[PDB]
């Protein structure tokens, strides 16, 4: 469901990295299991940056979301990444929103800023984002 390409965004989120859920779906935190499109290497852990659709499990939330495997998109990250126009930028916390394969967000609202890279990749996230940074 993603539209277009994404430039180089350094991936600061690993396997077993706990992020927050900015949705209103009753899931609090997710831990990344593996990253869609990740090209494997020996002893390398899967890596995710902004706008990267990951496969994550919810270890904290309401019972219909806990102890299950969902699909999310990283909207912000604490790792410092550089834009193509010489802008160096980083957020306050790692957050994600639950989307399906077709790319529509399960929730209805997003809390906090949403990075441009994830907003342009997924048109559904940008519509429900408060601000795009």
């Amino acid at each position: 469901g993603r539209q277009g390409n994404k430039f180089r965004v350094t991936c600061g989120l690993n396997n077993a990295s706990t992020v927050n859920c900015a949705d209103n779906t009753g899931a609090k935190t997710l831990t990344i299991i593996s990253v869609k499109g990740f090209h494997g290497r020996l002893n390398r852990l899967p890596r995710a940056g902004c706008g990267d659709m990951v496969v994550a499990t919810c270890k904290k939330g309401k019972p219909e979301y806990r102890k299950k495997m969902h699909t999310a998109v990283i909207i912000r990250q604490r790792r410092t990444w550089r834009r193509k126009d010489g802008v160096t930028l980083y957020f306050e916390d790692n957050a994600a929103v639950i989307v399906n394969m077709k790319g529509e967000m399960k929730g209805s609202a997003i809390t906090g800023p949403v990075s441009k890279e994830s907003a342009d990749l997924w048109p559904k996230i940008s519509s429900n984002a408060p601000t795009i940074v």
Binding site: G4, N5, F7, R41, L42, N43, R83, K84, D85, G86
Partner: protein, 388 residues
């Protein structure tokens, strides 16, 4: 048995053995293939790396998602004062490769060129080219020169001009020149020698050799590092912390029964002073004539290419220079052998027009804030000194 999991080998077998070069200058292994349907022209030059800075360039490629306000890219500065052509040599194609037939030199030769032929100049008698210069206008010696010109026109295929730098125009402490042979690509050998003869004793500026937005190949010697271990030289995996006798080494150096260590294993040794050729490097600014400054069509303030406080470990650039996109092999003050591309790049990015919007000239030490010292004083204002 088979290795449990597969992974690419560490290090390239194309650069084996890793032997450090002996001379700072790097000789180009080849020149662009000659075409006989064009005017004679030089196919190379030589400059000294001054440093690096960054620029903001306006994107001219269409059908791209790059920002419309510019893209931040690095640029390497190569100061290239004019060369002096002090001779030429003709090469003949035999059944064992090119063979230099004769070399014809000019009447007047600079002491920078003469210093190459000694090893202790301060003790030498400095009688280089003395007999050649003194008897240059003799009737016998002149006749010999005409034969050399006619021999090349008859039994030669490749003509190169022996050009040497003028080290008095650069902040380097070295006084001995740097000599480079620049092949002449163009018309027939008849008009190639005529072009070479015209260039004798003259000066060739880099603007005549290279154009604008032209991708070139650069050959230079990298930055030395000395004896280095396996981790740095090749990039093997560091061993677990529990390991006896050390962590930064290759655990297994071969199986039992090839009975010998293979050349393909990663062994500790010398990393550093190697010769490397990098192709398809774009010229961003041809710093000759009017473009010798650092101003742009958008930023109109007048400033030179040298950052405040001079280039680190180099000095001040006041001659012609080239702005090359990205990185080239070698530290500051290194000698770089430029060359026209052997395989001309035909990609859309190669033919893209370069329009600079801002060239950074802040100090390359610390976290600088100002572009010129005049605007540093204006912002800061008068201080305790100067006002007292």
């Amino acid at each position: 048995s088979h290795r449990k999991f597969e992974a690419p080998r560490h290090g390239s077998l194309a650069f084996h053995p890793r032997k450090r070069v002996h001379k700072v200058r790097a000789t180009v292994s080849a020149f662009p293939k000659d075409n006989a349907a064009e005017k004679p022209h030089l196919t190379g030059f030589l400059g000294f790396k001054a440093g690096m800075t960054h620029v903001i360039r306006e994107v001219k490629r269409t059908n791209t998602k790059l920002p419309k306000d510019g893209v931040l890219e690095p640029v390497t500065i190569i100061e290239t004062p004019p060369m002096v052509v002090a001779g030429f040599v003709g090469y003949k194609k035999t059944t064992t490769g090119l063979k230099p037939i004769t070399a014809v030199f000019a009447e007047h030769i600079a002491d920078e060129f003469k210093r190459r032929y000694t090893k202790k100049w301060y003790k030498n008698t400095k009688n280089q080219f003395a007999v050649h210069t003194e008897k240059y206008n003799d009737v016998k010696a002149k006749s010999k020169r005409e034969r050399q010109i006619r021999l090349i026109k008859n039994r030669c295929d490749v003509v190169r001009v022996i050009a040497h730098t003028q080290m008095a125009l650069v902040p380097l402490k070295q006084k001995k020149a740097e000599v480079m042979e620049i092949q002449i690509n163009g018309g027939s050998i008849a008009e190639k020698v005529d072009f070479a003869v015209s260039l004798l004793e003259k000066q060739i500026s880099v603007n005549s050799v290279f154009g604008t937005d032209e991708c070139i190949d650069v050959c230079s010697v990298t930055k030395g590092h000395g004896y280095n271990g396996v981790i740095k030289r090749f990039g093997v995996r560091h061993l677990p912390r529990k390991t006896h006798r050390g962590l930064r080494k290759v655990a297994c150096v071969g199986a039992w029964h090839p009975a010998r260590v293979s050349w393909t294993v990663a062994r500790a040794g010398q990393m550093g002073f190697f010769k490397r050729t990098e192709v398809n490097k774009k010229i961003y600014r041809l710093g000759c004539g009017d473009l010798k400054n650092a101003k742009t069509e958008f930023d109109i303030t007048e400033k030179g290419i040298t950052p405040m406080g001079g280039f680190p470990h180099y000095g001040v650039v006041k001659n012609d220079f080239l702005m090359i996109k990205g990185t080239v092999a070698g530290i500051r003050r290194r000698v770089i052998s430029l060359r026209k591309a052997c395989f001309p790049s035909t990609t859309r990015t190669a033919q893209e027009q370069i329009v600079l919007k801002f060239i950074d000239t802040s100090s390359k030490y610390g976290h600088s804030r100002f572009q010129t010292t005049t605007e540093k004083k204006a912002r800061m204002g008068p201080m305790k000194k100067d006002l007292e």
